Coordinates of N, CA and C in Angstrom, one line a residue:
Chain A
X49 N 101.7 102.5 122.9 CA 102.6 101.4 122.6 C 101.9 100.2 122.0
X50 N 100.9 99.9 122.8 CA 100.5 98.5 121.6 C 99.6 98.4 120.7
X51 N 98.8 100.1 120.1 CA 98.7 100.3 119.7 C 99.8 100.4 118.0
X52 N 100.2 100.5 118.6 CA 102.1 100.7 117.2 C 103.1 99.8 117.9
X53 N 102.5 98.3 118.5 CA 103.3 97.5 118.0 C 102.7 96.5 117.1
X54 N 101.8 96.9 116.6 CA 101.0 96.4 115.1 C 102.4 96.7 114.0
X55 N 103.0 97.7 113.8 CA 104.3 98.6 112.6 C 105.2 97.4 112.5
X56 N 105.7 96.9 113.9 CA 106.8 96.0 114.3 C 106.5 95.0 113.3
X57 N 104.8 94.3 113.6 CA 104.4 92.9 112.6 C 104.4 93.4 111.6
X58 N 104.2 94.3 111.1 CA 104.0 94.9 109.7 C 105.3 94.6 109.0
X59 N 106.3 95.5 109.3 CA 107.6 95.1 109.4 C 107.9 93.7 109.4
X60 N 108.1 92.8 110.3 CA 108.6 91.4 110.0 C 107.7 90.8 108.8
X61 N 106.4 91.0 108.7 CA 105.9 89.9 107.7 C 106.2 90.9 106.2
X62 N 106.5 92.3 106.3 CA 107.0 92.6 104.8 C 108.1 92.3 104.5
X63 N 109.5 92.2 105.8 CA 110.4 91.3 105.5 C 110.6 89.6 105.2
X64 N 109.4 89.3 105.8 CA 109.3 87.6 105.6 C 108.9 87.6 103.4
X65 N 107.6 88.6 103.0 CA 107.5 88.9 102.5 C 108.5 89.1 101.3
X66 N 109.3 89.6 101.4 CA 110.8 89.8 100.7 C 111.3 88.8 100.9
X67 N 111.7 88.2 101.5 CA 112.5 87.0 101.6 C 112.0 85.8 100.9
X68 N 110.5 85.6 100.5 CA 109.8 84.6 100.0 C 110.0 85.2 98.8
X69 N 109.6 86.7 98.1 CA 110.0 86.7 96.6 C 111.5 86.3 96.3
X70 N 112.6 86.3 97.5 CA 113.7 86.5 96.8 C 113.9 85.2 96.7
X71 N 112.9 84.0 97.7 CA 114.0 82.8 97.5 C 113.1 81.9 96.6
X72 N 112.1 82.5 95.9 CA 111.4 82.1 95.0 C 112.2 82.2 93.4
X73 N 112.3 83.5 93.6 CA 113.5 83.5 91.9 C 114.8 82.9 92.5
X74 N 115.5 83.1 93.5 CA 116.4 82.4 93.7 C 116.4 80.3 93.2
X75 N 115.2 80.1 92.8 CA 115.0 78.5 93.2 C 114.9 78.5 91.4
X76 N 114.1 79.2 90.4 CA 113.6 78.8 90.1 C 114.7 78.8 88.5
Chain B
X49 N 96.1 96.5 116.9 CA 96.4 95.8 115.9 C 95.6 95.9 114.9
X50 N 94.1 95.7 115.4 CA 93.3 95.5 114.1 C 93.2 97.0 113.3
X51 N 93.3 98.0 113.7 CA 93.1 99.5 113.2 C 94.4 99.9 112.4
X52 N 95.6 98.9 112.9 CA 96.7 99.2 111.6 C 97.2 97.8 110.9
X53 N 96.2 96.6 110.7 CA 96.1 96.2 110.0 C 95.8 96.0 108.6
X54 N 95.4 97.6 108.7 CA 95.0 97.6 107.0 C 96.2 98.3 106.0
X55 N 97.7 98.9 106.9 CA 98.3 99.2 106.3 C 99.6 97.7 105.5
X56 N 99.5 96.4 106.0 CA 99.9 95.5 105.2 C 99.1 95.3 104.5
X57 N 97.5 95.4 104.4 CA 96.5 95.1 103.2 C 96.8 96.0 102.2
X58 N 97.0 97.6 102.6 CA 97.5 98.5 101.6 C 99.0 98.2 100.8
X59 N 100.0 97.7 101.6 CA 100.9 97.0 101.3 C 101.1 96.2 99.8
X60 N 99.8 95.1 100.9 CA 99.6 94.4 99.3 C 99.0 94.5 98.3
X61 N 98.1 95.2 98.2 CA 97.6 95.7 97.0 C 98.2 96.5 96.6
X62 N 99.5 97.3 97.2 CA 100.1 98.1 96.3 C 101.2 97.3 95.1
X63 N 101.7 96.4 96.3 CA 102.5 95.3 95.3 C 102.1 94.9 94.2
X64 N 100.4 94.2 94.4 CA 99.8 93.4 93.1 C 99.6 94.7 92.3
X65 N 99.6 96.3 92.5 CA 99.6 97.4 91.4 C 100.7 97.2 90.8
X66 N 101.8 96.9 91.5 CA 103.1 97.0 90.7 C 103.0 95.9 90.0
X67 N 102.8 95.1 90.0 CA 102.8 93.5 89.8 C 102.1 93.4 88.4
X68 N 100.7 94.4 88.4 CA 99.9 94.6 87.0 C 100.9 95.4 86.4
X69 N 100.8 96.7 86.8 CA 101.7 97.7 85.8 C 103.3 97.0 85.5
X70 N 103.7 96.5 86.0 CA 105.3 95.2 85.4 C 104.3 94.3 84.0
X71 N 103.6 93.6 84.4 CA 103.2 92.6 83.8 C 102.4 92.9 82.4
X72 N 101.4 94.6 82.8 CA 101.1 95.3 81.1 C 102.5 95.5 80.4
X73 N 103.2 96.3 80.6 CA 104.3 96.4 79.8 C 105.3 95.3 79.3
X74 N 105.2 94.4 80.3 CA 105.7 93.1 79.7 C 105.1 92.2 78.8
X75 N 103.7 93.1 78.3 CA 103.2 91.9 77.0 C 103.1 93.0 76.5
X76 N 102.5 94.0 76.1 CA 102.3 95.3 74.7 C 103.9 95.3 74.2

């Protein structure tokens, strides 16, 4: 288990990730 | 954590691959 709940952060910061490219063209 | 921390480092250097290969074809 807390060995693979490293995936989980992986997961949120590649969706934070995405969210920064989209609201970057979104702005620009 | 630290043992699958290198799959967001892989992550992003795949991105900045895409990011080159987008960016060649966008100038030739």
């Amino acid at each position: 288990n807390p060995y693979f709940a490293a995936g989980g952060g992986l997961m949120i910061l590649g969706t934070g990730l995405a969210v920064a490219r989209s609201g970057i063209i979104k702005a620009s």
